[PDB]
Design a protein around this ligand. Structure first.
Ligand code: HEM
Length: 94
């Protein structure tokens, strides 16, 4: 479509509520906020893994190929490469 944007966890972390839930997967962030009541998984399920790494939590159920393409539609932006290796969780400075 056009030059994508480099989204960061520090930011996404903000939108970690129903109002706006994000989820990183395959070095790529996607928006499913509107796909909350559309996901055959539930809502609290997405939230539980909002603004965080849900790769394993996603691949766990081996998302159907159609899902791998669905995301494309519900795309938002790309997650910084020097961010994914941050695994925002185990503190930053401490
Ligand atoms: C845009 C994002 C997402 C899309 C498009 C998506 C799509 C799907 C689809 C299509 C299914 C399988 C249907 C089939 O194979 O026929 C599924 C299942 C599942 N998804 Fe997602 N998913 C998304 C995000 C997530 C997230 C963030 C989580 C976890 C937090 C999650 C957890 C699950 C689980 C656990 C299942 C199995 C359903 C069950 O609960 O029985 N999904 N997803």
């Amino acid at each position: 479509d056009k030059d994508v944007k480099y989204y960061t966890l520090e930011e996404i972390q903000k939108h970690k509520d129903s109002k706006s839930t994000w989820v990183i997967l395959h070095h790529k962030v996607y928006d499913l906020t509107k796909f909350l009541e559309e996901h055959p998984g539930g809502e609290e399920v997405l939230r539980e893994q909002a603004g965080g790494d849900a790769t394993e939590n996603f691949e766990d159920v081996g998302h159907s190929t159609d899902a791998r393409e669905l995301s494309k539609t519900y795309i938002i932006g790309e997650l910084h490469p020097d961010d994914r290796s941050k695994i925002a969780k185990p503190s930053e400075t401490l």
